[PDB]
């Protein structure tokens, strides 16, 4: 009850005469909405992970995955992946999101060098032929392929780059093979002293050691919750409901609120609109392209008026900033954070400018102010 909440907030078994702030009330959600796009075809991860032949890391190959359903649990449960490390999501959560594009980058490197695929690293791979951006969002997936991919006298198709005038930019691809003039001399023609053909091959026989063996990398890359989505986890969508407090999820933008049809006019490329506080406050539904206002579920301050425990256990409750046409909706037809209802029974309800006071009778006599409420109103204990 509200008196027990004041005792708990004061950390005392006795409360003196006064008015005390307590936990803000808030209407809790009655059901869950999920709205992903109505897309049905599975994503072609087979073409990415069961490719017959991977690219050399100097010439890493990019595939673009779109308009499809991506069950990442299928990938992540496969013990085939020796490393599966994600940098702006957790692999558990991959099924609960939608992405604006997914680019899979495929290449071969030396197993000890997989360490350099992580974002912001340094060393010859991360410097000269495949660099992730510092803010990279995605998963680096790596596995040993020696038994499929190495050959008995060796495989030698797999060039890396040993030189470059400068570091490359993130997700740059350099196919130039023009001779690297390392010395002070100019160097036309295929070689020279202190002038090198800039690509050189890994040596991979199936006998060579773990860590020196050939590893296949896929890097999955994507961006989240600021743009219109096209790749999705296998989450089933549900009937969109309005004017009720609900747990929504649109394309992975989970939240709690009341949905309503807006007069906002989102440009075709927009999917979310935001308030002053960077919070999303409108959304375009991915299955019927109307723009919905999101409002937080109705809430407010609760303050408890007490004549004090030494006088009485009777208390009165101020729902501050609330018109009490709304507090009768906070009957147990839906749930609230404060579990006590009691005063919500009504009979002695009184709208003040400060919000609605429940459990105190309104009287036309004025008196000296005993417990102050606000906006001219006070309360007191009497016969």
């Amino acid at each position: 009850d509200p008196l027990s909440e004041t005792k708990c907030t004061l950390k005392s078994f006795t409360v003196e005469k006064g008015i005390y702030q307590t936990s803000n009330f808030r209407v809790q959600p009655t059901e869950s909405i999920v709205r992903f796009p109505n897309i049905t075809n599975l994503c072609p991860f087979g073409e990415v992970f069961n490719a017959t032949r991977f690219a050399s890391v100097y010439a890493w190959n990019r595939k673009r995955i779109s308009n499809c359903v991506a069950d990442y649990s299928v990938l992540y449960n496969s013990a085939s992946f020796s490393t599966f490390k994600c940098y702006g999501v957790s692999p558990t959560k991959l099924n609960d999101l939608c992405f604006t594009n997914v680019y899979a980058d495929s290449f071969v490197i030396r197993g000890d060098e997989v360490r350099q695929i992580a974002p912001g690293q340094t060393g010859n791979i991360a410097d000269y032929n495949y660099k992730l951006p510092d803010d990279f969002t995605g998963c680096v997936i790596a596995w040993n392929s020696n038994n499929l991919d190495s050959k008995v006298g060796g495989n030698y198709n797999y060039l890396y780059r040993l030189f470059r005038k400068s570091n490359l930019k993130p997700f740059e691809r350099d196919i130039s093979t023009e001779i690297y003039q390392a010395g002070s001399t100019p160097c036309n023609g295929v070689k020279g002293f202190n002038c090198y053909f800039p690509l050189q091959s890994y040596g991979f026989q199936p006998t060579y050691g773990v860590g020196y063996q050939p590893y296949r990398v896929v890097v999955l890359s994507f961006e989240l919750l600021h743009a219109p989505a096209t790749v999705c986890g296998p989450k089933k969508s549900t009937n969109l409901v309005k004017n009720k407090c609900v747990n929504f999820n649109f394309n992975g933008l989970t939240g709690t609120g009341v949905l309503t049809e807006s007069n906002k006019k989102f440009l075709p490329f927009q999917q979310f609109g935001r308030d002053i506080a960077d919070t999303t406050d409108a959304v375009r539904d991915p299955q019927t392209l109307e723009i919905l206002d999101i409002t937080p579920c109705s809430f407010g301050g609760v303050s408890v008026i007490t004549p004090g425990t030494n006088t009485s256990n009777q208390v009165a409750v101020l729902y501050q900033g609330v018109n009490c046409t709304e507090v009768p909706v906070a009957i147990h037809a839906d749930q609230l954070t404060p579990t006590w209802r009691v005063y919500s029974t009504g009979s002695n309800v009184f709208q003040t400018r400060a919000g609605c006071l429940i459990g105190a009778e309104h009287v036309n006599n004025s008196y000296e102010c005993d417990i102050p409420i606000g906006a001219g109103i006070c309360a007191s204990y009497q016969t």
């Binding site: 907030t9 702030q21 936990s23 803000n24 808030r26 709690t256 937080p296 579920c297 809430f299 301050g301 102050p372």
Partner: protein
């Protein structure tokens, strides 16, 4: 003579409607009660003024 009374709900500002944020905010102890108490002190002082 006075200034606007403000009260700031520390949980709703810091952790707005997340329980698994509220369970971390509890690990900082009394600070939200100090903030509420300080702002309540200021608010009562405005009527006193």
């Amino acid at each position: 003579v006075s200034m606007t009374k403000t009260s700031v709900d520390c949980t709703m500002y810091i952790c707005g409607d997340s329980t698994e944020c509220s369970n971390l905010l509890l690990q900082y102890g009394s600070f939200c009660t100090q903030l509420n108490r300080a702002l309540t002190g200021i608010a009562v002082e405005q009527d006193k003024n």
